[PDB]
Design a protein around this ligand. Structure first.
Ligand SMILES: NCCCCCC(=O)O
Lengths: 178, 11
């Protein structure tokens, strides 16, 4: 009995920082329904610190939230000269908040959950053949007590496409909802 | 740039 709090791939313009750089909302329209994703791939510069933040998510009655990510990561050997500037992980954070801060973003309020690493990187020959390796990772966070929360994703120089962000809680039939 | 996902364009 799961209750869904956020489902990016079911929805079809999240905050990004710094302005004008980094994560970008993308689509693949090779089939009748579009596939959306947040992508970043600034693998050559070596000084990247790109943040993607969900909108405010109502927590409902969840004490613990479960977070499922689906994503691709390109092999850093795809990028000639990227040995030291390219990474193959990204970082996952959260913040709790009673208030929807809107366009205001303060990194200092966020707590790291984990490094997110791919079980499978997508090598160049597979990318060009349109064969990507979709990874799935799950984490959970709590106890939570504020009205809502945010997730954020920090890129430090990897080539990542984030296709799915699902957040749910369990046993919502033991709670009274407002 | 490089693209993270094949055949993807900004939305
Ligand atoms: N780019 C800043 C590094 C992470 C700060 C977030 C934090 O732990 O509060």
């Amino acid at each position: 009995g799961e209750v869904v709090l956020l489902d990016f791939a079911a929805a079809g313009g999240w905050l990004t920082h710094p302005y004008g750089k980094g994560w970008d909302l993308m689509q693949n329209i090779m089939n009748d329904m579009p596939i959306y994703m947040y992508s970043v791939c600034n693998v050559m510069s070596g000084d990247q610190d790109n943040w993607l933040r969900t909108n405010w998510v109502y927590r409902g009655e969840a004490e613990r939230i479960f977070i499922e990510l689906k994503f691709t990561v390109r092999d850093c050997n795809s990028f000639p000269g990227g040995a030291s500037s390219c990474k193959e992980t990204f970082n996952l954070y959260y913040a709790e908040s009673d208030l929807d801060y809107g366009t205001n973003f303060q990194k200092r309020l966020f707590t790291k959950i984990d490094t997110i690493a791919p079980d499978e990187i997508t090598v160049s020959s597979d990318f060009e053949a349109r064969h990507v390796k979709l990874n799935v990772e799950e984490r959970s966070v709590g106890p939570l007590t504020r009205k809502g929360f945010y997730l954020a994703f920090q890129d430090i120089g990897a080539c990542v496409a984030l296709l799915s962000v699902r957040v749910y809680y369990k046993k919502a039939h033991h709670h009274h909802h407002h | 740039x490089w693209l993270a996902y094949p055949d993807s364009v900004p939305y």
